Design a protein around this nucleic acid. Structure first.
Lengths: 545, 141, 123
RNA sequence: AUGGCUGUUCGCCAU
RNA sequence: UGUCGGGUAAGUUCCGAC
RNA sequence: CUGCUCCUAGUACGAGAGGACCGGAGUGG
RNA sequence: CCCAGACAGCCAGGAUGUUGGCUUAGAAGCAGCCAUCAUUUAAAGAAAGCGUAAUAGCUCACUGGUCGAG
RNA sequence: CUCCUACGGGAG
RNA sequence: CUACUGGAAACGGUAG
RNA sequence: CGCGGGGUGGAGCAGCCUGGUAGCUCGUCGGGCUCAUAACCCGAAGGUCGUCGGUUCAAAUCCGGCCCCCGCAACCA
RNA sequence: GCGGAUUUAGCUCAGUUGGGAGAGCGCCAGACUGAAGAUCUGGAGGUCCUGUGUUCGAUCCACAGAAUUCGCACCA
């Protein structure tokens, strides 16, 4: 245990953290050849295409230090976003420290900051690393000041290194061992193993990556997954090198893989803890959950024949996505699809990109929105999931849309681009507090609008320095208006829209013109009209030939 | 007589302070101790005068500490109460919402005399008249 | 009849029609729920009962009833077809087993809990 | 710009 | 060049319908 | 007459997604 | 219009009632409507444009002096 | 079909 | 078995 | 663009060149028959006559001005 | 774009004395039925398209504007 060092790498760019990640492997295990980002360095297809880690594997290495001793380095790759805020914290919860790989030519950035802040909020040693010093545009001394200024971390003795040569990467490892404390626990205490990840191996079956917090796991041992309460036999276990080597036992403070014949990956959930059956730990390790989503959107196949594949693809994603929510939904116009919940914008964008490429699905995706509280003319309260079930306009006394309280953190320079979005999305400012050159904004925004991708638009307009947290607050009167169209008399639902009052008249006129372009002068007069309730707001009639 | 210095200025209610929107973040950015000021201000403000918004100049030091000098107040409002009305005219001079005797004008001029630059009582009264004309309040002399 | 009259064409059994097509020996099949509604009874009765058109695993889309008071049955909500027809509901030759898969059992039903779906009151 | 249709120019459609 | 169906990558002609 | 590809440079720009200038090489209709 | 100092240049200032009333989430000279006075003066528009969420802030009108004939 | 490959050819 | 020799391999070929 | 026919109680048709009298069928309303509904029977009501004006003692009626309604022609190059 | 017509309750629409905001459908209820329906009663139901103006008073009058619609012009 005294010789184990668990840590994760917070980096951007690439910054040379994941290529620091890569270079570390080269100077240790190897195993052989150091890979390149251009090469499929990260294993999954998603990572390959983007050329980013979405999430990597994690690696266990052995490093002989200058003191002549061998250190088991177990490191986890940290995905760099707050949509997976929970997942990130759980990886960091498995560490005693972290590396902050910063480009000497660029300087720090806000997606490497929130993970870095939470890393300090949990008592982890954060080692500053100045990367890519060989580049002509590298300014180490200045970037050192930036880390000390923005992050609040001491970087006077910050270790620096090259991506060209690999010089000083060993010194990064020397520092690591010196300053990150060894993992803690009782090798004899009741077994407590944190499930970091579980996947399916087409030959080995369900495999879990483990961190041992307490006790010792050996080959024969009958293990217990604490949530399910079921028991299993630890048939095989070992470490990654990254090569898969078996071991007789995983001891306290070590990271490795376990193969016991668990049915599916839900039988070994991420965050759960493994104890021994003969000697079960009294209390499961902290922070286990399922977890939940902010943002919602409907996804419908272009072709109804894709529906089968789409349903199965959601199921496939669901075995490994704990916070992905989906539920069946149908439209007259759009067809059979699924109403979907997401943690935020890039959670939605990852899944969409994955649905598009891996599962090869051409999909229609409606703009995101939320549920409502309706009071009938015959006074009473009903709740509407699906817009197709909303009472007739005449029967609505008051339509009440959910308001979300959005707590946002952002640097002062950006609030101009931020509150302009807020009010574009119908927000009302509730409070504003100053903290140095950082502003704490609290806004009340309609949930229907928070869910229809706005999270991305805030993250773009502030270049990822604004951090959103929203919860339900109230129902209120909506103040957005529903404009039908009926063409030749007949209701065309597919053509209906929800738009803000102030230009609902205007949006109605545009909808009629759009139609007039798609419908030529034909055999019979064709009347196209937009309407709110009983009231016609725009009518145009395509004269017959 | 001296020279400008690092400090923030703001007009806060008599006996009440500490809210984020009004104060807090305002001087909080400078590194001011909101908790100390709110209690310190209202402390002497109660004795000085309550119910009247008083502008104070908070002077912060390198020790992020601070001091403040308390001062004085406004007009349209005095004519509204004197006239017995709640709001202005909306269309001044066009339609009169209320009226004020020249006697009251003088009174209000006496109250604001502290903030007014008028050399004499007649002058300050003339100034008060300008406020009335802008709020649709005629004066009966 | 006459012995010889039979030797030509012996008596034969009248193949009974399985009043349960979406059966295939299967005592029950999963579903998909094409949609759920609230229809009306036959003629002697009234009140709008609850029915649903669920699509079976074998593509034998059919309609079922929703016994018990209330139900969370949404749309894409999958269910397990039971069988058994109804009277007031024409065609409906199947019923949805409550307290299984996605459909939840009755609420506060302290009697004949085996049906619908309610695992013990509170002991 | 080649084709489907049309005598068509044109136009609609496919690429 | 009515509308729908067929044929074609695409059919003011053609075949089947209303 | 002009497409495209490689380099510059995944650089400037960008919260991302995405993504040049200027200049250089090659291969096509 | 000006040697009772012109125009350009130049330096100085440009305040108080008041953030005018209404309106508005906010409208403080500067979204919009109405009013557009009084006080202090060498001068000082409830204000000409930019700007802020609103303030702030910057420049402008105005006037004083330097120069000296257009 | 599935897998290996040094693309010649192999394996179940 | 030995001595040679073809292939990435599977798998061979010469001579004694 | 031009010819010529027509706007009358709720619907469908008369009455107009021969200016003062608005006629018919259907339906609306009330009362009967019938257990009741139809049917059948008796008894009523209801029209700025398309509009803006002109001639006359008087205009559905005669003369012009448009507004919808219907038909017939609109040919040679 | 130029002109006319139109814009009143959820739908379809009356509304001419400048002062009452209406009908039918619709929906709910009461009466009636053995019930439902049909009829009669009643109730809930309004941004009289918006703004400004005229007026003691505006659905109504005036101006500006908006929207719908018709009239002025390529089978595919």
């Amino acid at each position: 245990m005294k010789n184990i060092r668990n840590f994760s790498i917070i980096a951007h760019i690439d910054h040379g953290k994941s290529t620091l990640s890569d270079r570390i492997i080269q100077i240790c295990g190897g195993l052989s050849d150091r890979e390149m980002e251009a090469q499929v360095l990260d294993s999954m297809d998603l990572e390959r295409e983007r050329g980013i880690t979405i999430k990597a594997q994690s690696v266990t290495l052995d490093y002989k230090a200058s003191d002549g001793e061998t250190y088991q380095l177990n490191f986890i790759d940290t995905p760099g976003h707050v949509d997976f805020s929970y997942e990130v914290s759980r990886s960091l919860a498995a560490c005693e420290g972290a590396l902050l790989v910063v480009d000497a030519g660029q300087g720090v950035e806000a997606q490497t900051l929130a993970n870095c802040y939470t890393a300090m909020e949990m008592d982890l040693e954060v080692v500053p690393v100045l990367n890519k010093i060989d580049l002509p545009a590298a300014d180490p001394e200045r970037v050192a000041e930036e880390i000390e200024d923005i992050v609040g971390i001491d970087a006077t003795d910050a270790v620096r290194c090259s991506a060209k040569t690999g010089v000083g990467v060993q010194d990064v490892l020397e520092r690591l061992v010196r300053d990150i404390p060894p993992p803690e626990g009782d090798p004899e205490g009741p077994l407590q193993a944190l499930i970091i990840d579980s996947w399916f191996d087409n030959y080995l079956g369900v495999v879990s990556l483990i961190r041992i917090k307490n006790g010792t796991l050996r080959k024969g041992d009958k293990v217990k997954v604490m949530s399910t309460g079921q028991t299993y036999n630890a048939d095989r276990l070992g470490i990654f090198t990254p090569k898969q080597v078996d071991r007789t036992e995983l001891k306290c403070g070590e990271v490795g893989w376990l193969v016991c014949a668990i049915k599916d990956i839900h039988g070994a959930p991420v965050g759960d803890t493994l104890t021994l059956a003969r000697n079960p730990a009294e209390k499961a390790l902290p922070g286990f959950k399922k977890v939940k989503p902010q943002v919602y959107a409907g996804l419908f196949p272009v072709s109804s024949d894709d529906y089968e594949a789409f349903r199965d693809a959601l199921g496939k994603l669901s075995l490994n996505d704990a916070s992905l929510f989906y539920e069946p939904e149908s439209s007259s116009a759009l067809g059979f699809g699924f109403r979907c919940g997401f943690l935020g914008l890039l959670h939605m964008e990852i899944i969409q990109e994955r649905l598009e490429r891996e599962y090869d699905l051409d999909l229609i995706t409606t703009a995101p929105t939320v549920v409502y509280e309706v009071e009938t003319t015959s006074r009473e309260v009903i709740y509407v999931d699906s817009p197709s079930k909303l009472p007739a306009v005449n029967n609505i006394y008051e339509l009440r849309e959910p308001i979300a309280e959005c707590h946002m953190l952002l640097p002062q320079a950006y609030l101009g681009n931020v509150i302009t979005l807020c009010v574009e999305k119908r927000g009302v400012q509730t409070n504003m507090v100053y903290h140095g050159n950082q502003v704490a904004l609290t806004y009340e925004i309609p949930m229907a609008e928070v869910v229809l991708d706005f999270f991305d638009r805030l993250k773009s307009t502030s270049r990822g320095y604004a951090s959103l947290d929203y919860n339900f607050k109230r129902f209120q009167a909506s103040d957005m208006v529903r404009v039908d169209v009926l063409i030749n008399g007949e209701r065309v639902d597919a053509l209906a829209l929800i738009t803000h009052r102030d230009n609902s008249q205007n949006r109605g006129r545009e909808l009629v013109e759009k139609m007039k372009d798609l419908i030529p002068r034909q055999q019979f007069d064709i009347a196209i009209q937009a309407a709110i309730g009983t009231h016609i707001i725009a009518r145009s009639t395509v004269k017959q030939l | 007589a001296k020279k400008v210095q690092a400090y923030v200025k703001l007009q806060v209610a008599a006996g009440m302070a500490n809210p984020s929107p009004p104060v807090g973040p305002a001087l909080g950015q400078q590194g001011v101790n909101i908790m100390e000021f709110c209690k310190a201000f209202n402390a002497k403000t109660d004795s000085i005068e309550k119910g009247l918004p008083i502008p104070v100049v908070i002077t912060v030091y390198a020790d992020r500490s601070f001091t403040f000098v308390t001062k004085t107040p406004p007009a349209a409002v005095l004519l509204k109460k004197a006239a017995g009305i709640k709001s202005g005219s909306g269309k001044p001079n066009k339609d009169k919402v209320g009226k004020i005797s020249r006697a009251q004008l003088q009174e209000i001029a006496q109250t604001k005399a502290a903030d007014m630059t008028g050399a004499d009582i007649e002058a300050m009264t003339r100034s008060i008249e300008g406020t009335a004309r802008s709020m649709g309040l005629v004066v009966e002399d | 009849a006459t012995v010889n009259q039979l030797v030509r064409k012996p008596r034969a059994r009248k193949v009974a029609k399985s009043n349960v097509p979406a059966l295939e020996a299967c005592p029950q099949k999963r579903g998909v729920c094409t949609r759920v509604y609230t229809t009306t009874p036959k003629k002697p009765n009234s009140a709008l009962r609850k029915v649903c058109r669920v699509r079976l695993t074998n593509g034998f889309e059919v309609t079922s009833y929703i016994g018990g008071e209330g139900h969370n049955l949404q749309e894409h909500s999958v269910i397990l077809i039971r069988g058994g027809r109804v009277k007031d509901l024409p065609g409906v030759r199947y019923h949805t087993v409550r307290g299984a898969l996605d459909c939840s059992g009755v609420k506060d039903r302290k009697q004949a809990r085996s049906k619908y779906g309610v695992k013990r009151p509170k002991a």
